[PDB]
Amino acid sequence: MLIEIHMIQNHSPANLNRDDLGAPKTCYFGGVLRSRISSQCIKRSIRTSNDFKALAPDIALCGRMTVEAALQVAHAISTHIARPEIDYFVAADDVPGEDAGAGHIGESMFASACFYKYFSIDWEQLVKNLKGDTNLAAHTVGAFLLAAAKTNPSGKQNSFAAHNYPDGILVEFKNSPISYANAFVRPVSVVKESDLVEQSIGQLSNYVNDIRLGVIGFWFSPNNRYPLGYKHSKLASRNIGNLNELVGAVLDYIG
């Protein structure tokens, strides 16, 4: 069976991923230019985390020269139009001199977006390279869930402290790998009566309700801040307000 994790994370003005020219990584979707964090960036952010350090270690989770790592991650597609900005900066000389201004006087590139992150981890092959250690496989799945929830890319973070946690994570166990990027084909335009994160979650809920109406999924939001459907009908299997119980529910559903 397949475990699919969808996240809606809104990031403060930052420069998390960069190209050669210093511009934030960008993408095109729905006729609209969109911000992007590369999949390899998120994968490396998952690795080198002190949360896990404190079979063969460092081999089953990521291969090293096959291994055929079972965890896959899509590019972080923003829900709206990309809005790059210029950060005009100078570096002072802080000494009395004959001139003024000393730094490179550059133009840093940055943008802020609400990214849709797609993680798809298959249980079967992760068991396959774990020699049937179902308990250890569940433990590593939970560790990766915790990391992906509470880790961020280590981009230009000392000047852009963007450590925002996702406002909504949705875990489904469907048979085929379906990404909900098409939920945001229409770019999200913020209205006066709503916010960007709420509108993005509403669009995701609309896409989830559509197609199927014409499997089950666990919905997690911190303290149920953003409900995925405010009705008593059979729309979401469980509304989870805490991350640890979400990991527990995923674990005892898998095993």
Q: Where on the chain is the footprint of RNA (CB under 7 A)?
A: 15-20, 22, 25, 38, 40-41, 43-44, 47-48, 62-70, 88-92, 94, 100-106, 108, 122, 125, 128, 153-159
Query: Which of DNA, RNA, its own copies, none does 179 bind, CB closer than 5 to 8 A by kind?
Result: its own copies
Q: Which of 62, 67, 86, 105 binds DNA (CB under 7 A)?
A: 105
**CA dist 111 to 27, 166, 197, Å?**
13, 17, 16
Q: Shortest Cβ distance from residue 151 to RNA (Å)?
A: 11
137, 124 in Cβ contact below 8 A?
no
Query: Which of DNA, other proteins, its own copies, none does 188 bind, CB closer than 5 to 8 A by kind?
Result: its own copies
* Six-digit token string for 96: 């009395």
Q: Which long-range contacts (CB under 8 A, 24 or more apart) does 244-252 make?
A: 246/145, 246/169, 246/171, 246/218, 246/220, 247/142, 247/145, 247/146, 249/218, 250/3, 250/141, 250/142, 250/145, 250/171, 250/218, 251/138, 251/141, 251/142
d(CA 73, CA 120): 6
Q: Which of 8, 79, 80, 118 binds other proteins (CB under 8 A)?
A: 118
**Candidate ranges 35-43, 100-108, 214-222, 227-235; the one touching DNA (CB under 7 A):** 100-108
* Six-digit token string for 154: 């280590």
Buried b (16+ CB within 10 A) or exposed e, 78-96: bbbebeeeeeeeeeeeeee
Q: Which of 59, 91, 185, 215 binds DNA (CB under 7 A)?
A: 91
* Size of site (CB under 8 A) for other proteins: 34
Residue among 147, 113, 126 nearest 35 (CA):
113
Q: Assess 124 for contact with other proteins (CB under 8 A).
A: yes
Query: Which of other proteins, RNA, DNA, none does 63 bind, CB closer than 5 to 8 A by kind?
Result: RNA
Sites for other proteins among residues 176-205 (CB under 8 A):
176-182, 185-186
- For the chain, give the longest Cα–Cα distance: 74
Q: Assess 144 for contact with other proteins (CB under 8 A).
A: no
Sites for other proteins among residues 78-107 (CB under 8 A):
none
Q: Shortest Cβ distance from residue 74 to other proteins (Å)?
A: 5
Q: Assess 49 for contact with other proteins (CB under 8 A).
A: no
**Candidate ranges 44-52, 99-107, 128-136, 176-184; the one touching DNA (CB under 7 A):** 99-107
**Placement of tokens 């981890």 in the chain:** 121
